[PDB]
Design a protein around this nucleic acid. Structure first.
Lengths: 128, 234
RNA sequence: UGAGCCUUGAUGUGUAGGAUAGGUGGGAGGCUUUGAAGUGUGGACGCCAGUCUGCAUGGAGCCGACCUUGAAAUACCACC
């Protein structure tokens, strides 16, 4: 043994593959990478990037949530994603564009918003 | 107690256990596990009941043994303050500090004492180095140094050894040759056991000697029972 | 399932170098079962050229000190 390297030569898992789940919400966007069985490995957000409701709800805040979430899972040795998205928010493709641009390989993008057979009475915003 | 490595293997069919003998059979055995063509210098390894990890609380000093050690009496002195020529004339082969560091690490490695003055010790270990820390060099920290270099070399040419330990229970010191009889060997051991007791630190035990062993140059070690008035194996 | 002391196997922090100077202290080219050296190559270590380690292998053979990384050395023993 020599003295150790200046930047790591090695990484403790190499599971290769996962799913980026995005909840692009009406006030925010939340990005979490999870292993293929849905146990979450790391996450990051719009709102934690110095933004309130009024700015965290934008595709630009969401774009940054994707980068902090790509960094969140770096040690689990994932690089391959597919993508799942829910919620009315605009964090749905600018997020993905910056997700892929933070060193991951996307292959599929699929919606997982639950839609009803009529269902129950909706929540109200602006008394609508 | 013999060790096997890739780097010298001739010992494996000459010794066959990590075992302790009375000294009257240990030196009989050491003559088989001798690996050089020339008759080799022999060492004790003296393991101690000392609990010190601080240099000042470890054993430190030197002594003169009644009989020879097979050592050359080429003697080296690190100095930039003390009497260089009076040291060389007292029977030292080599004197300097920038390139003595190279001179000691060539030809025959059989020094009785490589001395420093405390005038030079800065560049021997701390800011400068002259061999790297290893037993062959005068210790950067403990009293193994004197500004009376011309005395220290005249002691060294008498077949004097050097003893100290640091974080581990080890004083290694040359004690004879492998041709020795066990009384000559025991009598240099008894001379050194006086000299570790006279230069004993407060943090050493009552049962001051843990184990003693005897070891030839290219060849292996085997262990002895002897530590006389301080043996744990009694 | 947590921790130490110690013995041992692996491993060595003063950085780099072709590479692997923990300490302490001694010391140097060696066979009769085996092989290091060194080449090749798996392992380990890591800097990408190598060593450490095992095997193919030499087994009348071979690694230091010159040279070199560096403030400074480097067969190879023993101890912790």
């Amino acid at each position: 043994a020599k003295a150790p390297i200046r930047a790591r030569k090695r990484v403790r898992k190499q599971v290769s593959d996962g799913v980026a789940h995005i909840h692009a919400s009406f006030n925010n966007t939340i990005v979490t990478i999870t292993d293929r069985q849905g146990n979450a490995l790391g996450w990051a957000t719009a709102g934690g990037s110095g933004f309130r409701g009024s700015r965290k709800s934008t595709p630009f805040a969401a774009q940054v949530a994707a980068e902090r979430c790509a960094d969140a899972v770096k040690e689990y040795g994932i690089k391959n994603l597919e993508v799942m998205v829910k919620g009315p928010g605009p964090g749905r493709e600018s997020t993905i564009r910056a997700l892929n641009a933070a060193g991951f390989r996307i292959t599929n993008i699929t919606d997982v918003t639950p839609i009803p057979h009529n269902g129950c009475r909706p929540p109200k915003k602006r008394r609508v | 107690m013999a060790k096997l490595t890739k780097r010298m293997r001739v010992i494996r069919e000459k010794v066959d256990a990590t075992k302790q003998y009375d000294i009257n059979e240990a030196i009989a055995l050491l003559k088989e596990l001798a690996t050089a063509k020339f008759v080799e210098s022999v060492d004790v390894a003296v393991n101690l009941g000392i609990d010190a990890r601080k240099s000042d609380q470890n054993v430190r000093g030197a002594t003169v043994l009644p009989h020879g050690t097979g050592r050359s009496v080429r003697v080296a002195v690190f100095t930039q303050g003390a009497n260089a020529e009076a040291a060389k004339a007292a029977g030292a082969e080599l004197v300097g500090m920038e390139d003595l560091a190279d001179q000691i690490k060539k030809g025959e490695m059989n020094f009785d004492v490589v001395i420093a003055s405390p005038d030079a010790m800065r560049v021997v270990g701390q800011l400068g180095q002259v061999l790297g820390p290893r037993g062959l060099m005068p210790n950067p920290k403990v009293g193994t140094v004197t500004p009376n270099v011309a005395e220290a070399v005249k002691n060294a040419k008498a077949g004097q050894v050097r003893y100290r330990n640091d974080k581990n229970g080890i004083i290694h010191t040359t004690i004879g040759k492998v041709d020795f009889d066990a009384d000559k060997l025991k009598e240099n051991l008894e001379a050194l056991l006086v000299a570790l007791k006279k230069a004993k630190p407060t943090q050493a035990k009552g049962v001051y000697i843990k184990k003693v062993s005897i070891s030839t140059t290219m060849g292996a070690g085997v262990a002895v029972d002897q530590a006389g008035l301080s043996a744990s194996v009694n």
